[PDB]
Design a protein around this ligand. Structure first.
Ligand SMILES: Nc1nc2c(ncn2[C@@H]2O[C@H](COP(=O)(O)OP(=O)(O)NP(=O)(O)O)[C@@H](O)[C@H]2O)c(=O)[nH]1
Ligand SMILES: [Mg+2]
Lengths: 134, 207
């Protein structure tokens, strides 16, 4: 029979308040499945490139729509290579230590955009982020 | 997990309706194309963030084929909510919904229950939304959903969260992006990392 206190609102803290946006755009994210040797979908939603204002580290962060769970979260490295898929100028693949699942897990990731312009802008900013990480 | 707020959620419905697929879609983001019948029950945690804090559903993904399992009346014990899945492409799965409801409520009197008509992505519904009257009774709720296209895919959980927490304005909020741990890869095997990254670049993206 005990009833319970409507818990309190907490302030919504996104974790990005210490960062600055370099890039923000909706996209579709894929994860390469090592076992089946096929791409598997990881999420659709907004990709962001963020620079910490203090450490100056720049990471890639992505959120799934509606549920707003993280589906990508890893520091961008100069060692990274963005490599378009097939002949597609709407998509790229790269290797990363991702922390979406709150665990540092190696993944090969593919990201596809709606217009080749958006993809070009993603590449451009991505590579631009590494331009300060050399 | 550390959220102090959690719920037992049992997910029921005929085999082939897309229950396990749905849970998985919430779980990893993937869309399992294949049909592998759930054996009995699989328990999977789903955490959501809200303007009132983190909540967790302990989802009991039961198999809908009659044939897999035993005591499912037993799986249902102390369940605080449920989803009943049916397939809008297959009316039998909707006509059987009433037994799922009877069977659940006789084990749990007051549970908020959602009816989901999965697979609305499929071009011709044989069971339209406007034929859905099952929710009429209070503590019931219906949604058209699709695990293929994400249509309404957060809603059953939003609604249940709202019900079980007691806040009709409760909102899912952005999962906080914790700083990713200062741990990079080992470049000694970076020599190796490329070819599987190629295997990737050699593999067309579906569509
Ligand atoms: N077109 C389409 N197919 C879907 C959708 N959701 C699930 N499916 C398909 O439904 C089939 C059965 O999935 P599954 O989740 O295993 O059904 P189930 O209810 O778990 N079966 P069981 O009760 O026996 O475990 C799969 O082949 C999957 O591709 C959807 O939104 N659209
Ligand atoms: Mg199942």
């Amino acid at each position: 029979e005990p009833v319970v206190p409507l818990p309190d609102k907490i302030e919504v803290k996104t974790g990005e308040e210490d960062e600055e946006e370099f890039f923000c755009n909706r996209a579709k994210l894929f994860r390469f499945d090592v076992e089946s040797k096929e791409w598997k979908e990881r999420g659709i939603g907004n990709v962001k490139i963020l620079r910490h204002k203090t450490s100056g580290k720049i990471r890639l962060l992505m959120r799934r729509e509606q549920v707003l769970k993280i589906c990508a979260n890893h520091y961008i490295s100069p060692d990274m290579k963005l490599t378009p898929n097939a002949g597609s100028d709407r998509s790229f693949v790269w290797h990363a230590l991702d922390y979406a699942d709150e665990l540092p897990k190696p993944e090969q990731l593919a990201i596809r955009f709606k217009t080749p312009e958006e993809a070009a802008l993603f590449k451009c900013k991505f590579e631009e982020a590494q331009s300060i990480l050399k | 997990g550390e959220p102090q707020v959690q719920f037992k959620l049992v997910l029921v419905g005929d085999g082939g309706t897309g229950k396990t697929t749905f849970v998985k879609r919430h779980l990893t983001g993937e869309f399992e194309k294949k049909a592998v019948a759930t054996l009995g029950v699989e328990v999977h945690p789903l955490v959501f963030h809200t303007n009132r804090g983190p909540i967790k559903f302990n989802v009991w993904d039961t198999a809908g084929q009659e044939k897999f399992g035993g005591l499912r009346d037993g799986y249902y014990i102390q369940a605080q909510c449920a989803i009943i899945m049916f397939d809008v492409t297959s009316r039998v799965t909707y006509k059987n919904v009433p037994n799922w409801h009877r069977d659940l409520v006789r084990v749990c009197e007051n549970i908020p229950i959602v009816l989901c008509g999965n697979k609305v992505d499929i071009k011709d519904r044989k069971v339209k939304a406007k034929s859905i009257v099952f929710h009429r009774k209070k503590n019931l709720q219906y949604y058209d959903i699709s695990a293929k296209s994400n249509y309404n895919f957060e809603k059953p959980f939003l609604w249940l969260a709202r019900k079980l927490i007691g806040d009709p304005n409760l909102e899912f909020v952005a999962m906080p992006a914790l700083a990713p741990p200062e741990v990079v890869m080992d470049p000694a095997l970076a020599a190796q990392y490329e070819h599987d990254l190629e295997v990737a670049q050699t593999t067309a993206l579906p569509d």
